[PDB]
């Protein structure tokens, strides 16, 4: 991401 | 070799000034000014935008920066420095009525992009051609992530959830005639309004996907009021259908829209809901607090999916989560700050 970010780990 | 010298070698001439613009997780974006004032964008990596820009170089009307140079180790990419007003800045200063025409123009340009490039999609590199297959694979694992997250939210999936999820996976893996070039990460910061029409930036997440994946930009990702999202989807559809006979079918288009919206809701639920449940101060993006954002996403999915005829376990499960979080959170669904003026609460 970068209109939203996934808390990947 | 200093970065400035690497850039000079890449371009064949030394810029007078290299100005950092954005520091991303994967790349630094730099504006490089030549002695004469002309500028280019260089991205420095420390990966398919380059291939996307090459692929779009004959698409008309022009919609993307032209590719200028890439270093041998592919860590530096130079592209045209397109200028205009970001959609983000336009949304900060306009009214709903004032934003309608540029938003419709963006939606039309995107429909023409998807429609014109659908017969060409096999010309993408293999990793990008296969993107929808990879995401459909991941859709299978997403079911368990969603079920576990719902449980942490206090909510069990309604009966039939797994069978309905299997249908979602199958639809997500069969874009069929809607398979096309997609940008993959449309946002107010990477859409420009220019005197020669809309332009798109930042093609890192390009892939072959359903055309409707990019439509999630205004249907599910940016919290446009339905007074704008509906005319955007209508303008988008007219442009896409001029190229793509399948988009002329009301039920087929509605089904594709519903598939991608259902996928988007449950996929993006996993990003930050655990954080929202814990309740610490947080934002979805700057200017948009996390709990109002998820309450918007919940309400917008349930209400717009119902309008599209949804009435199964996935909708019912979202309804159950919405009712729980509305009771548990003192917050209400809301829009971002500085966004189309004073909007009536959603």
CATH number at residue B277: 3.90.1200.10
DSSP class of B186 = -
Angle at B218 between CA B317 and CA B304, to 5 degrees: 35
**Structural domain that includes position B165:** 85-328
CA distance A2 to chain B (A): 8
B156 domain-assigned:
yes
Structural contact between residues B29 and B41, judged by C-beta atoms closer than 8 angstroms: yes
Structural contact between residues B152 and B328, judged by C-beta atoms closer than 8 angstroms: no
For chain B, what is the domain count?
1
B133 domain-assigned:
yes
Q: Which two tokens stand for residue B95?
A: 């009214």
CA distance B222 to chain A (A): 7
DSSP class of B208 = E
Structural contact between residues B343 and B91, judged by C-beta atoms closer than 8 angstroms: no
Assign residue B71 a region (left: φ > 0; alpha: ψ between -120 and 50; beta: otherwise). beta
B60 domain-assigned:
no
- Strand B76-80 to strand B39-45: parallel, antiparallel, or no bridges (unpaired)? antiparallel
SS3 B142: helix
Q: B265-269: list long-range contacts, CB under 8 Å, 24+ apart.
A: B265/B220, B265/B297, B265/B298, B265/B301, B265/B305, B265/B318, B266/B142, B266/B146, B266/B314, B266/B318, B267/B139, B267/B142, B268/A4, B268/B220, B268/B221, B268/B297, B269/B146, B269/B149, B269/B294, B269/B297
CB of B187 within 8 Å of a chain A CB? The answer is yes
Best A3, A7, A9 residue to mutate vs chain B (most B CBs within 10 Å): A3
What chain B residue is nearest to A6 in terms of C-alpha separation? B271
B50 domain-assigned:
no
Burial of B74 (0-12, 13-18, 19+ CB in 10 A): exposed
What chain A residue is nearest to B285 in terms of C-alpha separation? A4
Select from B131, B128, B136, B156 the least CA-distant residue to B267: B136
Reduced DSSP (H G I as helix, E B as strand, rest coil) percent helix, strand, coil of chain A, to 5: 0, 0, 100
Q: What's the rounded Cα separation, in Å, for the pair B9 and B42?
A: 12
B130 domain-assigned:
yes
Contact list in A for residue B284 (CB cut-off 8 A) is 4
Q: What's the rounded Cα separation, in Å, for the pair B179 and B172?
A: 11
Technique behind the model? X-ray
B108 domain-assigned:
yes
Q: What's the rounded Cα separation, in Å, for the pair B228 and B219?
A: 10
Residue B4 burial (CB count, 10 A) = 14
* Residue B303, beta-bridge partner list: none
B271 domain-assigned:
yes
B38 domain-assigned:
no
What chain A residue is nearest to B184 in terms of C-alpha separation? A1
CB of B45 within 8 Å of a chain A CB? The answer is no
Q: What's the rounded Cα separation, in Å, for the pair A1 and B300?
A: 21
């Amino acid at each position: 991401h970068x209109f939203g970010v996934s808390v990947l780990s | 070799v200093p970065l400035e010298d690497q850039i000079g070698a890449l371009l064949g001439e030394h810029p007078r000034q290299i100005v950092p613009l954005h520091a991303g997780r994967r790349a630094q974006v730099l504006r490089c000014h030549f002695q004469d004032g002309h500028s280019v964008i260089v991205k420095s990596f420390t990966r398919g935008e380059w291939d996307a820009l090459r692929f779009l170089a004959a698409h008309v009307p022009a919609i993307a920066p032209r590719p200028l140079a890439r270093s041998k180790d592919r860590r530096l990419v130079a592209m045209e420095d397109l200028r205009g007003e970001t959609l983000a800045r336009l949304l900060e200063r306009e009214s709903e009525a004032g934003a309608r025409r540029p938003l419709v123009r963006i939606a039309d340009a995107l429909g023409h992009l998807h429609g014109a490039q659908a017969p060409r999609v096999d010309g993408l590199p293999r990793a990008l051609r296969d993107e929808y297959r990879k995401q459909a694979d991941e859709c299978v694992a997403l079911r368990g992530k969603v079920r576990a997250l719902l449980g942490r939210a206090g909510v069990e999936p309604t009966p039939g959830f797994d069978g309905a999820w299997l249908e979602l996976v199958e639809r997500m893996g069969s874009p069929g005639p809607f398979l096309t070039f997609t940008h993959g990460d449309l946002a107010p910061s990477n859409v420009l309004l220019t005197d020669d029409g809309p332009r798109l930036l930042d093609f890192e997440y390009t892939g072959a996907r359903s055309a409707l994946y990019d439509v999630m930009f205004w249907e599910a990702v940016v919290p446009f009021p339905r007074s704008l999202a509906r005319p955007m989807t209508q303008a988008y559809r007219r442009a896409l259908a001029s190229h793509l006979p399948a988009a002329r079918d009301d039920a087929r288009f509605r089904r594709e829209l519903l598939t991608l919206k259902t996928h988007r809701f449950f996929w993006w639920l996993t990003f930050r809901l655990d954080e929202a449940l814990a309740g610490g101060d947080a934002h979805w993006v700057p200017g948009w607090r996390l709990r109002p954002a998820y309450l918007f996403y919940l309400q917008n999915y349930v209400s717009t999916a119902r309008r599209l005829g949804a009435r199964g376990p996935l909708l019912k499960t979202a309804q159950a989560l919405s009712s729980r979080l509305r009771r548990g959170w003192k917050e209400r669904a809301g829009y971002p700050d500085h966004f189309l003026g004073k909007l009536k609460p959603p």
